[PDB]
Design a protein around this ligand. Structure first.
Ligand SMILES: CCCCCCCCCCCCCCCCCC(=O)OC[C@H](CO[C@@H]1O[C@H](CO[C@H]2O[C@H](CO)[C@H](O)[C@H](O)[C@H]2O)[C@H](O)[C@H](O)[C@H]1O)OC(=O)CCCCCCCCCCCCCCCCC
Ligand SMILES: CCCCCCCCCCCCCCCCCC(=O)OC[C@H](CO[C@@H]1O[C@H](CO[C@H]2O[C@H](CO)[C@H](O)[C@H](O)[C@H]2O)[C@H](O)[C@H](O)[C@H]1O)OC(=O)CCCCCCCCCCCCCCCCC
Ligand code: CLA
Ligand code: CLA
Ligand code: CLA
Ligand code: CLA
Ligand code: CLA
Ligand SMILES: CCCCCCCCCCCCCCCCCC(=O)OC[C@H](CO[C@@H]1O[C@H](CO)[C@H](O)[C@H](O)[C@H]1O)OC(=O)CCCCCCCCCCCCCCCCC
Ligand SMILES: CC1=C(/C=C/C(C)=C/C=C/C(C)=C/C=C/C=C(C)/C=C/C=C(C)/C=C/C2=C(C)CCCC2(C)C)C(C)(C)CCC1
Ligand SMILES: CC1=C(/C=C/C(C)=C/C=C/C(C)=C/C=C/C=C(C)/C=C/C=C(C)/C=C/C2=C(C)CCCC2(C)C)C(C)(C)CCC1
Ligand SMILES: CC1=C(/C=C/C(C)=C/C=C/C(C)=C/C=C/C=C(C)/C=C/C=C(C)/C=C/C2=C(C)CCCC2(C)C)C(C)(C)CCC1
Ligand SMILES: [Cl-]
Ligand SMILES: [Cl-]
Ligand code: NA
Lengths: 61, 48, 145, 238, 37, 33, 30, 449, 45, 187, 58, 33
């Protein structure tokens, strides 16, 4: 499960890149937040899911 | 914490130390160090 | 006093290193003809390496007051080497003028110092009095721009 | 504070109170000193504590009198931890000897008119003799300053200058005493000890002592002054 | 060192600590973007 | 030396108390504004 | 005697400071 | 954002535009808190990635790992690192929490309400509503008290913390019977700050530390409740200035004092900052050098007790001004040093001559030598030793880094007390922008001062 | 012992109060200044 | 050469810290940071190098004719090292002193023999090896460590002596001194 | 303005008179001795370590 | 040249460009800065 943990961690790093570079853009954009609530919610949810997956994979192996 | 210590920072191809103005400053510092308190030191390192 | 020639117990002639003009105090070192230090008056008498007693240095004076006189006791040899680091050794009568024992400067040194300081101050004089010359109209005040 | 009372206290209960400099005092002994059992004893835990310092001074009329002084070096004048031998004889004869321990202390009293008198209060190699009521003897007094000590201008024995280099034209016989005459010759002092109390069961003794030793000669620069030191001493036998 | 699973991600960890000093520079960049309004 | 110590303690306490209770006595209202 | 001269010079400087503080010429407005 | 025309503050004082914008101020403070946690996590990960457990922690320039190790978490007897995993866990946790806090700061700074007074009355302070400000102080005071009790619980029922005074080389001990005596605990604060006393820096037991944190946690919770349920007294209203900048200035003064205290704690104390992780102190290194040379010359025959130095004062041993036997030389200035490796050699009257002859154990000698070779002396470019060295060793003691950095921070925050406090006073009075130019106070005063 | 000393240096004495007279004079001076302030100004709490 | 070119993106020559040296009949490795020295305290010194920073750290090789057929003809190694008592300097001070700790009466310097032994060689050559610690009343640099390696070949005695301050010895000069002592090889 | 001759003479006559000025003179002496050899190569000063002024155990 | 060095440089460039990139995107988009 070491390889699985590593690819999950890379996915988490990529999702964090996306969130860091997008959340300020969505927030400061005019009317951007209202039309992008779902996208940001999906991003945060998958980010937290990846965090917990990395945690459980670390626990396993 | 002290200042920069570039003593013997420049060495040649074979490893010989090439002196710099920092080395002359260090020579003067050594001159001051071995004389500042003639009788107060019983051990080689000041540390105080 | 004469000229002091220092010779070790081997017979190798030793020369005392003269004090450079920069040094108020200079350590005593007796040097071989080939520039190899052969004796000195060490600062640390413990485990000394080139001590006068260890090397056995004797001083013979040629000419002057002490002519053909040889001294071998280490105290006298140390004293005369310390004197010879200053150049030729002379006898001085210090009781007459109550000499303190620190070198003064010759009249050429005092002349040079005084007239150099005057030269600097008069460079400032050139600057000041010439600025006053060129700016005479405005040195009573300025009418804004 | 007897030996046990001092020993029970911890460092944190003693640091800062000045108790350390005090020597222990026997408390439940007997003043009858003749009752001590004769024999040879390894005298250890030997300590000395002065109670006064007086400096000899000779006046215009020649009346050499001892003048009281004021101490300057705080509570750094107690000798302790010394070891030695002692032979109590049947008639009371005593062969006292001191070998090791903190048997010297550099102190500096001040004389009226403002005179700083330093000296090594020491009992080094005190080979005493006499009766059990009072035994006297001589002890070594080392030079106050070691050979490697440098004077304010760098002069000194061993490591030093042997010359007043600040005067490149004055190193003559007018300064023979100050230059190269750094005489570190040890002197001698006289001491007298009287036993006051003895605890036979503990095997410890305590009493009074009086000593006379020269002051600091400052490496032979000026003559030594006689120092009289009275105090109380303690020790343990075997 | 890091546990053997996280060994390949060592460069990211070696780069991370300098971000806080990047935030103040980002604030200066943002102010410059608005002509220091 | 005890008398000197108690005297200095009294002096220091007096001055420090003056400071503390002077800065409390409605100081912020002592401005021209 | 040198100590006497030094003390006199220091006392003179301090007295000059005292006079320049408490006996200054008033700053005349306009 | 804002502009200078509508606010009166230029860009180089732009955060001053947030004084009366409660929501954006909350966002800014949350963002800076996220920054603090992010540095904590990232630097912890950096340290563990660059850490080799074979070498001592202070050899490798680590500041956070000693902090974690002092709380237990993977250290064996003598301060030996067993598991580096807890350090990694701490780094990851602080880092992820920092990500959350950064998102929160961004939200409350960009999209959240600019002013919270209307929509969220519970968070709508006014910088002069004394009751509300005391309520906020009480909430955060309760949080601080809970943190102190958290430390107490860690030391009591969760494996204890690293006692460097434990017999041997020190070990992780569970502190039982904390010092809960009022006289002992409060005697530290009224203790002198000079030598031999050291104020609170001279705390030496773990029991004293745990009892003190017990008292501080309980008092902080009680004071939080008190400041929640009460309004400042009428005398308190007149004594203080009531504005946001005034509160900032008070906090600046407090944390400058705390920074100076932390600098001195890191430099002097070795109980809460064990030398196994932070390295020896200055006094510790000096005493270690003296001890090492004493044992070396004592092994080579000789009698250190009677050995007289060049000054005639004692080459190895002498008497402290109070009378306690102490190491000779310059290290006599550090006679009040106390360490785990030197206390066994101290009798009632200080260093014991008998114990110094035969009671010395080899581990003490090894630790003393190691401390002597790693004295807290270094250069700016991390070159170990005195200023006159050969530029061969790469070492500056973590104690030196902590002391220097937090002293600089303490001084600058004292200057902050000065600046922000003077400005608060002037703004309250009305002089913040300058003299009136129509009614100067000076023109209403008699001449000649 | 050749003289008398305070023997207080290097001790955890509160405010340096080795003897109660010092604490009493400290309390008296502070309380007197406080009484002056209280009877002049208004302290209530 | 003038057109040789720089060493951009190149490789170092050596980082061992020791450089070879070939004598009249001996081979040696000297520290890179140590400079050649001119002074000859003993007229029979044929080689000398000194540390750039602390001149107390130095070494010199002495080659002088010997009547003894082999180094073993001197006798025991301790007897041999007792023969060369002048290599530890001379106490020029001659004053009666007892106020120095750890030293006998009227003495300001003391040499302690930490250990002696005999070594071998690729050709079976025997070398006398000595380690000494010299302390002084002023305690200069906390004493001085002296390493001596002596051999007799072709009617000549070769003696290498390395001196290091204890202050320098504690902080890494021991490696350099031991390397110098090990590398000393004679035919 | 290297020296005050009165203080030098007093120190020479009195081996226990010390001021910060004399300590500064000693420091200057150390600086000169330990810097001359490498600061002024043209002098070719091969001073043995036993002639360099030095304190105790330093 | 080193793989760790290559990854370090890549991560450094990414994190450095992250801030100016979002600033530029908000400027071109018209977001309130
Ligand atoms: C005005 C005088 C300020 C003196 C001062 O305060 O500075 C020193 C004190 C700390 O005092 C030191 O406190 C030390 C406590 O360590 C002792 O206790 C330690 C406990 O681990 C160790 O055992 C250590 O070995 C042992 O020596 C020692 O007592 C020192 O002698 C003592 O000087 O700083 C402090 O109290 C904190 C206050 C610093 C103020 C800085 C002001 C800057 C403007
Ligand atoms: C503008 C500032 C200068 C540019 C940055 C230069 C720099 O810094 O670059 C140098 C270092 C990187 O140095 C590297 O890391 C090491 C630094 O030494 C550290 O690591 C060594 C072991 O490798 C030792 O443990 C040593 O004790 C320890 O200090 C070694 O020097 C490595 O060879 C080297 O590659 O940057 C760093 O560390 C990062 C520094 C981040 C800020 C740290 C602030 C701490 C100081 C606060 C104030 C203190 C005092 C007041 C001011 C004075
Ligand atoms: C950590 C320090 C810090 C913090 C927390 C703040 C916070 C704040 N500042 Mg400020 N500022 C700072 C430092 C700081 N500043 C410094 C050093 C200066 C001197 C140059 C200034 C000068 C300044 C001025 C002149 C002004 C502010 C203003 C503001 C407020 C409005 C921000 C805004 O909407 O702008 C716009 C926001 C953007 C352009 C978006 C770009 C930046 C975002 C936050 C991206 C962050 C990147 C990050 C990785 C995102 C992580 C996402 C997460 C999910 C992981 C805000 C609460 C304004 C104010 O007064 O409020 C009314 C104002 O005018 N500041
Ligand atoms: C000191 C910390 C702090 C404080 C005082 C507040 C206070 C507040 N938050 Mg906030 N928040 C914080 C941290 C904080 N937050 C953090 C760390 C995050 C990231 C998880 C958030 C994310 C967040 C969101 C998404 C929202 C709030 C909202 C609110 C407001 C609603 C009150 C409530 O229901 O609770 C309130 C004034 C709500 C709001 O702003 O109302 C529009 C809301 O939507 N907060
Ligand atoms: C950092 C947390 C904190 C803060 C910011 C405040 C702030 C405040 N408190 Mg509060 N308090 C706190 C914690 C805190 N308190 C705790 C934990 C408790 C429980 C014990 C209390 C109990 C308390 C009470 C009972 C009262 C206050 C009051 C006040 C207000 C008046 C302040 C004052 O009297 O001026 C300054 C204070 C003084 C000049 C007196 C100093 C007293 C201390 C103990 C001196 C100790 C000196 C000692 C030698 C240590 C010196 C070392 C030092 C240099 C570090 C003020 C806004 C008063 C109030 O307004 O009622 C609401 C009030 O009656 N507080
Ligand atoms: C560049 C900014 C900067 C940086 C990088 C640091 C960094 C550091 N500071 Mg510093 N500081 C700064 C600015 C900075 N500071 C400023 C501006 C000031 C004001 C002048 C201070 C004042 C200051 C003080 C007073 C102290 C530090 C300290 C420290 C060190 C420890 C940090 C810490 O743990 O804090 C504190 C951590 C918290 C507040 C959160 C703790 C929350 C709980 C209680 C943790 C408990 C965990 C628990 C036991 C585990 C769970 C157990 C459970 C299972 C039961 C650290 C290396 C400390 C130090 O080491 O002294 C040298 C110290 O005491 N700093
Ligand atoms: C928690 C502490 C704190 C807080 C919340 C504030 C808050 C505030 N300050 Mg203040 N200040 C503080 C501490 C603090 N300050 C300290 C410690 C000092 C002393 C140095 C000052 C000195 C100060 C001045 C002179 C001014 C303020 C001003 C202000 C207001 C606007 C600040 C701003 O955005 O400017 C913009 C921020 C910047 C331009 C960034 C500055 C860049 C710094 C210098 C970089 C230094 C980093 C360096 C590498 C660290 C090394 C430190 C040391 C280890 C060597 C604001 C409300 C202004 C005001 O008057 O209020 C109306 C103002 O003029 N402050
Ligand atoms: C940081 C300070 C932490 C220590 C706080 C208590 C200080 C203390 O108790 O001092 C006690 C100390 C030490 O007091 C001494 O302690 C010694 C050891 O115990 C001895 O007992 C001495 O006899 C004793 O005098 O006194 C001082 O050093 C000065 C105290 C007074 C200073 C007043 C300054 C006031 C200035 C502004 C006030 C603003 C409000
Ligand atoms: C991967 C991994 C892991 C795991 C991890 C995790 C999963 C973590 C988590 C993390 C988290 C998930 C954290 C949390 C965070 C959050 C935060 C930090 C926030 C808080 C809050 C606040 C701060 C605020 C609050 C409030 C409000 C909002 C309202 C009012 C009131 C108050 C203010 C209170 C492990 C272990 C295996 C290790 C290894 C790696
Ligand atoms: C308001 C504003 C400001 C500020 C801002 C800020 C400061 C924010 C915050 C921010 C932040 C502070 C954020 C955070 C982030 C973080 C994150 C997002 C994390 C992530 C993680 C991950 C992705 C993973 C990792 C890993 C692990 C865990 C394991 C090991 C390895 C690694 C490390 C890889 C400014 C100045 C601009 C100005 C303007 C306004
Ligand atoms: C934890 C722990 C402990 C304990 C500690 C403690 C017990 C603490 C507390 C402390 C404290 C108890 C503190 C307090 C402080 C206070 C203060 C610092 C005050 C100040 C004052 C002020 C700031 C005011 C001012 C003013 C006046 C005077 C006048 C008018 C105006 C005003 C009001 C502003 C120990 C040691 C065991 C160590 C270990 C840890
Ligand atoms: Cl000095
Ligand atoms: Cl020392
Ligand atoms: Na010295």
């Amino acid at each position: 499960m070491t390889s699985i943990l590593q690819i999950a961690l890379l996915g988490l790093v990529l999702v964090s890149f996306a969130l860091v570079v997008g959340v300020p853009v969505v927030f400061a954009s005019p009317n951007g937040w209202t039309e992008n609530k779902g996208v940001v919610f999906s991003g945060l949810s998958v980010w937290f899911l990846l965090v917990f997956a990395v945690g459980v994979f670390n626990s396993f192996a | 914490l002290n200042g920069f210590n570039f003593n013997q920072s420049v060495v040649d191809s074979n490893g010989r130390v090439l002196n710099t103005w920092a080395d002359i400053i260090n020579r003067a510092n050594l001159g001051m160090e071995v004389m500042h308190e003639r009788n107060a030191h019983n051990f080689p390192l000041d540390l105080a | 006093l004469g000229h002091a020639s220092f010779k070790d117990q081997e017979g190798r002639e030793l020369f005392v290193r003269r004090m450079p003009t920069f040094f108020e105090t200079f350590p005593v070192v007796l040097i071989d003809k080939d520039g190899v230090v052969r004796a000195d008056v060490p600062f640390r008498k413990a485990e000394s390496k080139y001590s006068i007693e260890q090397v056995g240095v004797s001083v013979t004076f040629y000419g002057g007051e002490l002519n053909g006189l040889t001294f071998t006791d280490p105290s006298t040899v140390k004293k005369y080497a310390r004197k010879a680091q200053l150049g030729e050794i002379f006898e001085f009568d210090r009781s007459t003028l109550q000499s303190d024992g620190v070198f003064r400067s010759s009249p050429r040194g005092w002349f040079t110092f005084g007239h150099l300081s005057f030269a600097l101050l008069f460079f400032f004089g050139h600057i000041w009095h010439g600025s006053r010359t060129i700016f005479r109209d405005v040195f009573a005040g300025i009418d804004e721009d | 504070l007897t030996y046990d009372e001092l020993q029970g206290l911890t460092y944190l209960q003693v640091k800062g109170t000045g108790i350390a400099n005090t020597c222990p005092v026997v408390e439940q002994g007997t003043s009858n000193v003749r009752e001590l059992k004769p024999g040879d004893y390894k005298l250890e835990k030997f300590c000395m504590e002065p109670t006064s310092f007086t400096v000899k001074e000779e006046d215009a009329k020649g009346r050499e009198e001892f003048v009281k002084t004021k101490l300057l070096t705080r509570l750094t004048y107690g000798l302790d931890g010394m070891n030695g031998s002692m032979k109590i004889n049947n008639d009371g004869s005593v062969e006292f000897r001191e070998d090791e321990g903190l048997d010297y202390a550099a102190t500096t009293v001040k004389l009226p008119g403002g005179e700083y008198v330093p000296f090594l209060f020491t009992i080094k190699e005190f080979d005493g003799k006499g009766t059990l009521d009072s035994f006297s003897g001589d002890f070594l007094v080392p030079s106050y300053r070691g050979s490697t000590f440098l004077d304010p201008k760098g002069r000194g024995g061993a490591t030093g200058y042997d010359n007043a280099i600040a005067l490149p034209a004055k190193a003559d016989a007018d300064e023979i005493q100050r230059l190269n005459n750094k005489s570190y010759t040890p002197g001698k002092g006289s001491a007298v000890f009287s036993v006051a109390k003895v605890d036979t069961e503990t095997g410890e003794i305590a009493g009074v002592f009086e000593s006379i030793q020269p002051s600091d000669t400052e490496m032979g620069a000026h003559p030594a002054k006689d120092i009289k030191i009275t105090g109380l001493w303690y020790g343990q036998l075997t | 060192k890091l546990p053997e699973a996280y060994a390949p991600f060592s460069p990211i960890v070696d780069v991370l600590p300098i971000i806080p000093v990047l935030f103040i520079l980002l604030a200066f960049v943002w102010q410059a973007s608005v002509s220091f309004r | 030396m005890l008398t000197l110590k108690i005297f200095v303690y009294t002096v220091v306490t007096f001055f420090v108390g003056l400071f503390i209770f002077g800065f409390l006595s409605n100081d912020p209202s002592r401005n021209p504004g | 005697m040198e100590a006497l001269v030094y003390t006199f010079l220091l006392i003179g400087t301090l007295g000059i400071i005292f006079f320049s503080i408490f006996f200054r010429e008033p700053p005349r407005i306009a | 954002g804002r502009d200078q025309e509508t606010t009166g503050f230029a860009w180089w004082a732009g955060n001053a535009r947030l004084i009366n914008l409660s929501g954006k101020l909350l966002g800014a403070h949350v963002a800076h808190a996220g920054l603090i946690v992010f540095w904590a996590g990232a630097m912890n990960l950096f340290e563990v990635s660059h850490f080799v457990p074979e070498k001592p922690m202070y050899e490798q320039g680590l500041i956070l790992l000693p902090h974690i190790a002092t709380l237990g978490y993977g250290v064996g007897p003598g301060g030996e690192v067993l598991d580096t995993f807890p350090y990694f866990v701490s780094g990851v946790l602080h880092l992820i929490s920092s990500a959350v806090l950064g998102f929160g700061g961004v939200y409350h700074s960009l999209i959240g309400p600019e002013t919270l007074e209307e929509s969220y009355p519970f968070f709508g302070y006014v910088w002069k509503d004394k009751n509300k400000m005391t309520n906020i102080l009480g909430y955060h005071l309760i949080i601080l008290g809970c943190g102190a009790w958290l430390l107490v619980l860690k030391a009591l029922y969760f494996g204890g913390v690293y006692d460097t005074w434990a017999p041997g080389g020190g070990d992780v001990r569970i502190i039982s019977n904390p010092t809960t005596n009022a006289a002992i605990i409060f005697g530290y604060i009224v203790k002198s700050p000079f030598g031999g006393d050291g104020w609170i820096v001279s705390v030496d037991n773990l029991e004293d530390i745990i009892g003190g944190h017990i008292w501080i946690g309980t008092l902080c919770i009680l004071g939080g409740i008190w400041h929640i349920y009460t309004t400042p007294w009428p005398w308190a209203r007149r004594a203080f200035v009531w504005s946001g900048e005034a509160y900032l200035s008070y906090s600046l003064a407090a944390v400058s004092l705390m920074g100076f205290t932390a600098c001195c704690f890191a430099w002097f104390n070795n109980t809460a900052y064990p030398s196994e992780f932070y390295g020896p102190t200055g006094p510790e290194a000096s005493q270690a050098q003296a001890f090492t040379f004493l044992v070396r010359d004592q092994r080579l025959g000789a009698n250190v007790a009677s050995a007289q130095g060049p000054t005639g004062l004692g080459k190895y041993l002498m008497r402290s001004p109070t009378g306690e036997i102490i190491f000779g030389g310059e290290t006599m200035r550090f006679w009040d040093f106390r360490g785990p490796w030197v206390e066994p050699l101290r009798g009632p009257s200080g260093l014991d001559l008998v114990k110094l002859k035969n009671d010395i154990q080899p581990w003490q000698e090894r630790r003393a030598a190691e401390y002597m070779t790693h004295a807290p002396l270094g250069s700016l470019n991390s070159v170990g030793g005195v200023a006159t060295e050969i530029n061969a060793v790469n070492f500056v003691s973590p104690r030196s880094w902590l002391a220097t950095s937090h002293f600089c921070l303490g001084f600058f925050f004292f200057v902050g007390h000065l600046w922000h406090a003077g400005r608060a006073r002037a703004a309250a009075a009305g002089f913040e922008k300058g003299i009136d130019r129509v009614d100067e106070p000076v023109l209403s005063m008699r001449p000649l001062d | 012992l050749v003289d008398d000393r305070m023997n207080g240096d290097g001790t955890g004495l509160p405010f340096g109060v080795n003897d109660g007279i010092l604490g009493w004079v400290i309390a008296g001076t502070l309380g007197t200044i406080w009484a002056i302030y209280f009877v002049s100004q208004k302290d209530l709490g | 050469a003038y057109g040789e070119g720089a060493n951009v993106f190149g490789r170092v020559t050596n980082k061992s810290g020791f450089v070879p040296y070939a004598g009249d009949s001996f081979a040696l490795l000297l520290p890179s940071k140590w400079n050649p020295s001119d002074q000859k305290e003993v007229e029979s010194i044929v080689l000398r190098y000194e540390d750039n920073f602390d001149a107390v750290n130095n070494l010199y090789v002495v080659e002088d004719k010997s009547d003894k057929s082999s180094i073993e003809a001197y006798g025991t190694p301790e007897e041999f090292i007792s023969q060369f008592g002048y290599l530890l300097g001379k106490q020029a001070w001659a004053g009666q002193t007892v106020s120095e700790g750890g030293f006998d009466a009227n003495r300001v310097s003391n040499a302690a023999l930490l250990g002696v032994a005999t070594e071998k060689d690729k050709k079976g050559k025997t070398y006398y090896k000595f380690e000494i610690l010299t302390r002084t009343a002023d305690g200069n640099e906390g004493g001085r460590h002296q390493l001596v390696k002596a051999t007799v070949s072709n009617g000549k005695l070769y003696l290498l002596k390395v001196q290091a301050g204890d202050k320098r010895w504690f902080k890494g000069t021991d490696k350099e001194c031991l390397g110098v002592l090990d590398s000393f090889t004679v035919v | 303005a290297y020296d005050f001759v009165s203080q030098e003479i007093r120190a020479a006559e009195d081996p226990e008179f010390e001021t910060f000025y004399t300590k500064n003179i000693l420091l200057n002496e150390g600086i000169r001795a330990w810097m001359a050899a490498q600061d002024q190569p043209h002098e070719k000063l091969t001073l043995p370590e036993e002639v360099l002024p030095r304190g105790n155990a330093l | 040249m080193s793989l760790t060095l290559i990854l370090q440089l890549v991560a450094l460039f990414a994190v450095v460009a992250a801030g100016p990139l979002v600033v530029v995107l908000l400027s071109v988009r018209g977001g309130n800065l």
